[PDB]
Amino acid sequence: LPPIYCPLESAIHPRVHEVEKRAVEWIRRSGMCASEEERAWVIATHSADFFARFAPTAADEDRLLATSLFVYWLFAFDDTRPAQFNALAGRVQRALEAPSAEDNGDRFVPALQDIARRFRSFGTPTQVRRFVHAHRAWLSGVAWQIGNQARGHMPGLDDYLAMRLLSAGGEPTFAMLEIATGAEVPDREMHRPAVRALTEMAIMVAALDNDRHSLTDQNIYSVLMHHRGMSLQEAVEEATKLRDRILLRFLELHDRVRPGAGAELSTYLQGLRHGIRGNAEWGLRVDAPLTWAESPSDSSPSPLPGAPSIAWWWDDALLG
Amino acid sequence: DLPPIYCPLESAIHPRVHEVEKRAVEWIRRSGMCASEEERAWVIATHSADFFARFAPTAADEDRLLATSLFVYWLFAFDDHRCDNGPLSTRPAQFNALAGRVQRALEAPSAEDNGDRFVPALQDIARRFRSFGTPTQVRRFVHAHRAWLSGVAWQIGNQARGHMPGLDDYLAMRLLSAGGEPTFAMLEIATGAEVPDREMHRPAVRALTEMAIMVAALDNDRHSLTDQNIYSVLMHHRGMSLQEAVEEATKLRDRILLRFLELHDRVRPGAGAELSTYLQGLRHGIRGNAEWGLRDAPLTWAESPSDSSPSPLPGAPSIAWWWDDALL
């Protein structure tokens, strides 16, 4: 119901329409889609538009295209029993890490191995490893989500946020920023806990803005209605306060970290911000005047009570 | 009828192994990881300090060898109570949630246990790793850890279904499920020798690491001799007798160790000091895994490999890139 708090930079790659054209071509020739109907559904995600908002100045069009292809792949992959899914997650992950892996008629594997080949031609082995690890973390979150559903386990807030941090696909999406820009972030800066907390907070906000398409009954609203005995409206109210409070922490930690940051880490952080805005904006649009909340619905500087898995995001002692 | 192991690698053990084992035994008693005295004695009897003292035998800091040794105890204990034997060993849906809760606890110190006695123990190990490892080395460990849990989740999925994976899926799965990724990723932590990203992530070093892990895994399948292991896989998929499968298994394991030795000899000369140390660790680890498996008494080793082919293994495309030098 209420308008989104997002005081972050909005921009989109100027060559977005050219990337999109090539991406529609790759989707058609990729084998990942059985019928015309399924290819139109994938094309209709507008994933080139989505990702062009994450890396709006990427110098290499090919880089943007490759990264964009994976966002199309991820929406096509998302669209299985836990036991089979755990095997499928293992095979798909192996194919990403081993080019000699063979498809065995699985329609997703050749397409991901084509994305991986492209990533290997542009990115350092280091950047490829970051993407590989982010990819496994997303697959873990999806395995967790499919598990809860098969059992009829509605997770509490803490488990839901931990799981949705992985299952929403934000880890692999944000790990593509460097591959798209070419700006290699040194280990010493990338793995600073402060930078990990910023990455996870960007991911968590994009995930909660995606949930907002209550229009998978494992979502923040279901979780709060089931565990707090709230109505839908009391839960939309409570979800917005949680989310706004996370993005308020992100802006605060970002302003403490940005000043000292080198060129490559600065580009990456601008990416986090472009991606949070891009994610909210793309969700609302998929050129109408959009209204944005000028102010957060909850301004508390404190950790979320009930969510101890994310409280370290607020512990400055632990982030230095 | 069990042929001796081909392992012409350096066997060595930390001179302070007994001092570290004593501290390890006391941590175990205080950890809360063990419900009963029978469990404490089971975990102590793994001799995991002996095990990892063979992986990092010149570790300058005893506290680093202790912390990495604790995770080896933890791993045996978590494998035996939550992965291999209890209600979760055929309940992938419940395991996927545990894998998620444990992995999150490793990455987030503010995480709460929720009635899990394995979690506070892991968090203590994690606190140790963050006290003296770099954030980079901690992330290398965290990522290796999730990789191992994904293998176990795959394995448990296969078990619930009574699905016997083919050779390709079994080697892919077992590369993860046998716990070699997070075991080998603790070398740097024990040792203190931080390997730069550009060296660590080199396809050649990744392949040497996978090969080290795959030999240790198949040495572990041998040590344990329906069940998903190399022997049941070859018996089911090639219609072999146990005896033919034991011989086929030794052959393919020996082929992988030969490629590892061959790639090692090409990479080692140019390696800087930290990558050299890491490499030595892979070698010490393969041998130490095999040797700890067979235990005072004289051990017999095979002098020659049972198969000397220099090409990729038939029926396992997922590992063929270990032999592709243009890619490495």
Residue numbers in the entry:
A (entry chain B): 8 to 86, 96 to 231, 240 to 310, 325 to 358
B (entry chain A): 7 to 231, 240 to 309, 325 to 357
Q: What wording appears in the published article?
A:
Spiroviolene synthase (SvS) from Streptomyces violens was first described by Rabe et al. and represents a bacterial class I diterpene cyclase that we were not able to produce in sufficient quantities for crystallization due to protein instability.
The variants could be grouped into four categories based on their substrate preference in a Malachite Green assay: promiscuous (I), inactive (II), diterpene-specific (III), or sesquiterpene-specific (IV). Therefore, the altered substrate preferences are likely the consequence of steric and/or electronic interactions with substrates, intermediates and/or products, as discussed for the individual variants below. Furthermore, the studied variants were dimeric in the crystal structure and maintained a substantially elevated melting temperature similar to that of SvS-A2. The Gly83Leu substitution may shield off not only Phe79, but also Phe82 and Phe84 from the substrate, which are putatively relevant for cation stabilization. Since our modeling data suggest that Phe84, which is conserved in bacterial sesquiterpene cyclases, is involved in stabilizing cations for both the sesquiterpene and diterpene reactions, sterically blocking this residue by the Gly83Leu exchange results in a near inactive protein.
